[PDB]
Design a protein around this ligand. Structure first.
Ligand SMILES: Cn1c(=O)c(CCC(=O)O)nc2ccccc21
Ligand SMILES: [Zn+2]
Ligand SMILES: [Zn+2]
Ligand SMILES: [Zn+2]
Length: 100
């Protein structure tokens, strides 16, 4: 199971009214693969197995929690774990509707 809570959920920000585009490419390298969206600032960057731009974004912003456009899991870089909570249901659901 993911963690049912983490102390960084307070940094999850409201979903843009434009919604989410789960096919949006990495904002740095343009890859279509393994992208995540930041749940603070809603920038999209690639995963560790591509070019690691979301990890870079975490390092230079401190933003904690990111949502996968592959499986709609949410990862906290500080807690080094997946997290699921009601504060994440709306954003997951918007991504699920856009994806599927
Ligand atoms: C298991 N795991 C993850 O799922 C993620 C997702 C986010 C990313 O790819 O940037 N990052 C990790 C970063 C270090 C260690 C483990 C990690
Ligand atoms: Zn990238
Ligand atoms: Zn961010
Ligand atoms: Zn956390």
């Amino acid at each position: 199971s993911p963690l049912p809570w983490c102390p960084h959920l307070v940094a999850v920000c409201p979903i843009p009214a434009a919604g989410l585009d789960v096919t949006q490419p990495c904002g740095d390298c343009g890859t279509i693969q393994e992208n995540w969206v930041c749940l603070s600032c809603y920038q999209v960057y690639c995963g560790r197995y591509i070019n690691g731009h979301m990890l870079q974004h975490h390092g230079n912003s401190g933003h904690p929690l990111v949502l996968s456009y592959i499986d709609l899991s949410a990862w906290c870089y500080y807690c080094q774990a997946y997290v699921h909570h009601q504060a994440l249901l709306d954003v997951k659901n918007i991504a699920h509707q856009n994806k599927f």
